[PDB]
RNA sequence: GCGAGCGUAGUUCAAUGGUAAAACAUCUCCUUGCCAAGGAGAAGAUACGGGUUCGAUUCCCGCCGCUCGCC
């Protein structure tokens, strides 16, 4: 009932049962059956998030005292085929509610869009009551929540988890599927959807029991997606054959003054402020001067809910000067006794100057009749009315919404404040008429004010608390955090990829210190800081003497905050996330690390080639040779192989399934603790480097072998088994995987062979690899090397004349392409590029049959006896792997006997048989540079 | 999967509302001949389709290819 034109304001309460989250009722947060509260509003009323905050203080919360935050989180579900954009609501660190605008459902777009608010009533009641474990929540006066739902939590888990008969469910799945597919032919949507409901249930208690393998999930999701995809198209029609019984949705001259334009919004993401406070100022800078208007210091600003721009002392009229303008040539328009044909009139009509006010000028060919024009001063406030809406509509985001019309933006626009001097610039955009009002800090005494003159805008804004200048929020975060961190004895850890995302989550910052327990310090350091940074957005604190962690953290509130309830509320969320990660860790140190391999066989890699255990199986059997292609020392080929079986073992651990960014850290941590060598453990970490664009590369010796051998397999397998990247679409990430393999080499001084390693790591795969499909992987790698090499300030014509035969070993190519440009800029390049061109053109094909023929059989020539000597004494130096400088000094002395041979000897055949000496003697001199550079492409030939 | 930027002789690049320029390559004519080099001349392009305007390579829409970020 969100599909159609039908208005549907409704709100209900329902439990929700998901069995794979059943944990016998012991961990205080996860339940197999939890109550929700759902409210859907269609159409969107407009107050849709000022009714929410009345709801909160209705259920007894003090919203001027706690810290309510709208942190963005999109929503998508492919099974139903729906998605939407919106936020989640953090009260004092706890995520309590989701808030979404819908845009797809089934597979047909929505009109009008719906608003979905979904409270979760057991994560709210533990916070509002000071309780850590759900079985202490007071249900009513006298009875507890545990004493009602505990054994249902306890023994429905044993059913969904161990004793669920798993074939009388595999049959019921297909039975329900068939019945729902049949009742979609008598045109009955209601039961034909209830059967989809009770089939997608029976799939969950299959998945929980583990009976679903790894390759059946892609089939089950498909089987059940096209049932919801085609119940929708039946419902939306059976509605309209009734006639929609619930209505239908249809719809002056003076000195210069400043000019300020703000576009209020609802909370934008943290990185849609940065890429939208630029393509607005640029798009304004252009159009201010395109229309002949002069100004001064233009300056942008940003906040999660406004995007302001200020242009100072803007003009009051256009510049109003007369400019020349030339039109069509005298050939097209002008003619003898036929001057106005069809073009002269079109050239004067759009300019309305009289037709006898034209003259001629030597415009190249003394043509292009023309005249003058006027600029038409237009008061600088009726100009902007025409050009602002196309400014504001210009900004473009990757993800975008619709709320009440077909206009698209990233979040709904709520107010527009655009003024100039004292007067308002009047226009309208997306149903909002511009004015001079603005909302300050929400839920304050200045939640609505009006600014009179545009020169006291900023001074009024920061009179309501807001700090809009983005670069003066960083300096009030990182400078009131230091006093706190030094009051306890330490200092903060602020990677500037976290400050750029803490700045744009706040409007008027306020920092607070908090304490967590000391007995959590036994965890690894890089799980503490990852909990405190990548999920909660806190600041850790490290004692600057003996620089390890302390039991403190720093959090950033927003506004007029009680700062006695928010510290106490934040201290008790990462007393729970730590308390879960500690249980996971203690469950992971129960077994030696070498046993976590045999769980790997339940992670999919690719369908027709398999899991991850087989892939890591196909690497121990080849990492004993890629250490010979790289020329690794002999006394380390043992110490690599035992660190190759343990590789990628931590990917089945309990932690790494929860914190999927610690793949690689929590393998070295276990390995060192188990009692391996140091270099084994350190190599167990760089099988993952680099993880993205711009990360450290493997430096140790056994760290390169594995990081190369993995990237060879994930290339040859994915290529020779269907998934080729031939598209703009990038599945399986075949671009960065191929890009990193050349950086691990050019950054590490290694000599490799791309056409021998790919003839040996393809031999192993399960599917057959023919010699033709590895000749495209070499090209897909060489193009990536060329792109890496061009954008280092290199010239484009030399990197295509070294990559013809030095393209195999990616280090020597990147070595000899930088060393060739510096030689190309010196004044010996035109001597050599010609010296080698006189004997490669002259031999464009004359049936040289006797292959070698270089002999003194009959060499009765004069200059031959002095040319072949030079060829031998240079060819004795140039070996197939020499550098470019020995070449560039060994050909300069060969260039002279060339012009002493061509001067006299008549190479072409005046005799019948003996004219092949004179041909081979130049074929050889032409072929010497085969292996160093392909000299027949460079210009100047 | 979505966005962003691009497409001009054979290769590299200037221009813009209305006679699309130059470099290297190609061709012909020269002759201390066949190669090279110095000289004159000639031919050669806006990926494709649609829209307004008198005229679009330029402004608008749609299709094809390429490069790059996220998934």
UniProtKB/TrEMBL annotation:
It comes from the Eukaryota. One of its GO terms (cellular component) is mitochondrion. It holds the Pfam family tRNA-synt_2e. Residues 834-927 form the DALR anticodon binding domain. Its main location: cytoplasm. Keywords: Aminoacyl-tRNA synthetase, ATP-binding, Cytoplasm, Ligase, Nucleotide-binding, Protein biosynthesis, Signal. InterPro entries: aa-tRNA-synth_II/BPL/LPL (IPR045864), DALR_anticod-bd (IPR008909), Gly-tRNA-synth_bsu (IPR015944), Gly-tRNA-synth_heterodimer (IPR006194), Gly-tRNA_ligase_asu (IPR002310). Its EC number is 6.1.1.14. The keyword Aminoacyl-tRNA synthetase applies. GO terms for molecular function: arginine-tRNA ligase activity; ATP binding; glycine-tRNA ligase activity. It is found in: Cytoplasm. GO terms for biological process: arginyl-tRNA aminoacylation; glycyl-tRNA aminoacylation. The keyword Cytoplasm applies. HAMAP family: Gly_tRNA_synth_alpha (MF_00254), Gly_tRNA_synth_beta (MF_00255). Belongs to the class-II aminoacyl-tRNA synthetase family. This is glycine--tRNA ligase.
């Amino acid at each position: 009932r969100v599909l159609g034109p039908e208005p549907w304001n409704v709100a209900y309460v329902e439990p929700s049962i998901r069995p794979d989250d059943s944990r016998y009722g012991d961990n205080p947060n996860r339940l197999q059956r939890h109550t929700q509260f759902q409210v859907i509003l269609k159409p969107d009323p407009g107050n849709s998030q000022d009714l929410f905050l009345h709801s909160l203080s209705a259920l007894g919360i003090n919203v001027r005292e706690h810290d309510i935050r709208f942190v963005e989180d999109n929503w998508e579900s492919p099974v139903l085929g729906a998605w939407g954009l919106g936020w989640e609501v953090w009260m004092d660190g706890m995520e309590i509610t989701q808030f979404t605008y819908f845009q797809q459902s089934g597979s047909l777009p929505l009109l009008p869009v719906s608003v979905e608010i979904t409270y979760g009533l057991e994560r709210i009641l533990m916070s509002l009551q000071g309780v850590d474990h759900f079985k202490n929540i007071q249900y009513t006066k006298g009875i507890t929540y545990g004493e009602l739902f505990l054994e249902n939590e306890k023994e429905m888990s044993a059913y969904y988890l161990e004793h669920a008969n798993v074939d009388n469910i595999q049959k019921h799945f297909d039975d329900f599927e068939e019945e729902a597919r049949s009742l979609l032919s008598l045109w009955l949507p209601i039961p034909a959807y209830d059967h989809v409901l009770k089939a997608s249930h029976a799939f969950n208690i299959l998945d929980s029991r583990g009976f679903v393998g790894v390759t059946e999930r892609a089939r089950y999701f498909g089987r059940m997606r096209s049932l919801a995809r085609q119940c929708a198209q039946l419902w939306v029609k059976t509605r309209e054959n009734l006639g929609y019984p619930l209505g239908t949705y249809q719809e002056v001259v003076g000195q210069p003054r400043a000019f300020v334009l703000e576009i209020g919004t609802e909370e934008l993401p943290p990185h849609d402020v940065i890429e939208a406070t630029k393509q607005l100022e640029k798009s304004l800078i252009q159009i201010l001067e395109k229309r002949r208007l002069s100004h001064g210091k233009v300056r942008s600003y940003g906040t999660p809910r406004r995007l302001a721009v200020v242009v100072e002392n803007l003009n009051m009229k256009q510049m109003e000067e007369e400019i020349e303008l030339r039109g069509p040539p005298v050939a097209k328009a002008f003619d003898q006794e036929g001057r106005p044909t069809k073009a002269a009139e079109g050239f004067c009509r759009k300019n309305n100057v009289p037709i006898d006010s034209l003259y001629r000028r030597t415009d190249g060919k003394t043509e292009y009749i023309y005249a003058r024009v006027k600029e038409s001063a237009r008061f600088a406030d009726e100009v902007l009315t025409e050009d602002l809406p196309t400014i504001i509509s210009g900004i473009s985001f990757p993800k975008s919404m619709r709320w009440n019309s077909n206009i698209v933006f990233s979040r709904p626009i709520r107010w527009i404040f655009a003024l100039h001097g004292d007067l308002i610039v009047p226009f309208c955009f997306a149903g909002i008429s511009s004015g001079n009002q603005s909302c300050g800090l929400r839920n304050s005494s200045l939640a609505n004010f009006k600014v009179e003159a545009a020169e006291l805008y900023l001074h009024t804004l920061e009179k309501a608390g807001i700090l809009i200048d983005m670069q003066e929020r960083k300096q009030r975060i990182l400078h009131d955090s230091s006093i706190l961190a030094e009051g306890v004895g330490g200092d903060i850890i602020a990677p500037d990829s976290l400050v750029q995302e803490v700045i744009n989550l706040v409007e008027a910052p306020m920092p607070i210190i908090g304490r967590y327990d000391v007995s959590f310090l036994a965890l690894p350091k890089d799980v503490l800081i990852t909990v405190m940074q990548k999920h909660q957005k806190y600041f850790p604190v490290t004692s600057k003497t003996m620089g390890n962690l302390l039991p403190c953290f720093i959090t950033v509130a927003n506004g007029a905050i009680k700062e006695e309830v928010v510290r106490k509320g934040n201290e008790a969320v990462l007393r729970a996330r730590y308390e879960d990660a500690k249980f996971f860790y203690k469950m992971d140190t129960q077994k030696k690390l070498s046993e976590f391999r045999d769980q790997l066989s339940s992670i999919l890699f690719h369908e027709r080639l398999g899991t991850m255990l087989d892939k890591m199986k196909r690497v121990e059997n080849t990492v004993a040779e890629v250490a010979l292609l790289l020329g690794i020392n002999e006394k380390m080929i043992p110490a690599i192989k035992d660190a190759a079986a343990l590789a990628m073992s931590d990917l089945a651990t309990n932690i790494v399934t929860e914190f999927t960014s610690l793949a690689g850290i929590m393998a070295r941590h276990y390995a060192l603790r188990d009692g391996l060598s140091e270099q084994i453990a350190e190599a167990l970490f760089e099988i993952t480097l680099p993880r993205f664009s711009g990360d450290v590369f493997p430096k140790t010796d056994p760290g390169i072998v594995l990081a190369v051998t993995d990237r060879l397999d994930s290339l040859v397998g994915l290529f020779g088994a269907g998934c080729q990247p031939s598209s703009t679409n990038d599945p399986f990430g075949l671009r960065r995987i191929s890009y990193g393999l050349v950086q691990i080499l050019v950054e590490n001084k290694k000599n490799f062979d791309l056409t021998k390693a790919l003839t040996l790591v393809a031999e192993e795969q399960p599917i057959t690899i023919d010699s033709g499909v590895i000749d495209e992987v070499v090209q897909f790698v060489t193009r990536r090397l060329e792109q890496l090499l061009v954008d280092e300030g290199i010239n484009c014509e030399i990197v295509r004349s070294v990559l013809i035969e030095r393209a195999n070993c990616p280090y020597l190519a990147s070595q000899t392409a930088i060393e060739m440009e510096a030689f190309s800029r010196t004044e010996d390049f035109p001597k050599i590029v010609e010296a080698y061109s006189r004997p490669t053109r002259i031999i464009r094909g004359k049936e040289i049959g006797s292959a070698l023929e270089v002999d003194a059989s009959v060499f009765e020539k004069d200059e031959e006896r002095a040319l072949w000597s030079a060829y031998l004494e240079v060819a004795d130096k140039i070996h197939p792997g020499v550098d470019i400088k020995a070449f560039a000094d060994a050909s300069l002395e060969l260039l002279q006997p060339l012009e002493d041979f061509f001067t006299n000897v008549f190479v072409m055949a005046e005799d019948e048989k003996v004219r092949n000496n004179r041909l081979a003697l130049l074929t050889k001199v032409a072929s010497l540079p085969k292996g160093i550079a392909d000299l027949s492409v460079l210009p100047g030939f």
